[PDB]
């Protein structure tokens, strides 16, 4: 078939710049945070266990 | 979640059935 449409969608996608952000901790300190986020202080529980990325 | 059971029962065989079943278990 025709090869004229070869970069169509990537070409028409509007460009959005990445936001500036703090650096993320690495190594032991990143694993520490995760441990704190998942195991240290989690009191609320309504029988759902919402995922870490529950947008809705 | 009851919402998961509802969304699964609406379309037991659909684009979102596998995810909702995995959530139910």
């Amino acid at each position: 078939g025709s090869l004229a449409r070869a970069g169509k969608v990537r070409g028409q996608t509007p460009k959005v710049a990445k936001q500036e952000k703090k650096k993320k901790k690495t190594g032991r300190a990143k694993r520490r945070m995760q441990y704190n986020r998942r195991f240290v202080n989690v009191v609320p529980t309504f029988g759902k266990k919402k995922g870490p990325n529950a947008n809705s | 979640c009851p919402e998961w059971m509802d969304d699964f029962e609406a379309d037991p065989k659909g684009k979102y059935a596998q995810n909702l079943l995995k959530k139910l278990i």
Binding site: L3, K8, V9 | -
Partner: protein, 141 residues
């Protein structure tokens, strides 16, 4: 039933090897016709010259045009159709240019939609396709 006597070792071994010849993978690996017919000649990758850009129809349940290239391997001259993975990536390839081709993922078997295609382009003009796609490198002049 199978023989079970203490002196039946030769019968068991001969039967096992004869029946081993009836296994698809074993026969493919040990007969020598598959390696002869393999365009890569048993190599993991190969290098070829782009002959033309071609568009291949996707299989019936889904409609699309898969952008591939006809390449001629340097080491044996065999002609091959190789898939150019990402979008816009066909624009990184020109005619009569060096390309490094690898397998598609299932041991010389066609993958997914694309019919009769078992190779994908890894490098174009000695620069990786991923680097070109992500803007890390530009096409040499």
């Amino acid at each position: 039933g199978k023989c079970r006597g203490l002196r039946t070792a030769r019968k068991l071994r001969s039967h096992r090897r004869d029946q081993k010849w009836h296994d698809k993978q074993y026969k493919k690996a040990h007969l020598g016709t598959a390696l002869k017919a393999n365009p890569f000649g048993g190599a993991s990758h190969a290098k070829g010259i782009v002959l033309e850009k071609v568009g291949v129809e996707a299989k019936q349940p889904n409609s699309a045009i898969r952008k591939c290239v006809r390449v001629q391997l340097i080491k044996n001259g065999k002609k091959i159709t190789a898939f150019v993975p990402n979008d816009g990536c066909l624009n990184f390839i020109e005619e009569n240019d060096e390309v490094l081709v690898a397998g598609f993922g299932r041991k010389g078997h066609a993958v997914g939609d694309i019919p009769g295609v078992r190779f994908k382009v890894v490098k174009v003009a000695n620069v990786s396709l991923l680097a070109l796609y992500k803007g890390k490198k530009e096409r040499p002049r």
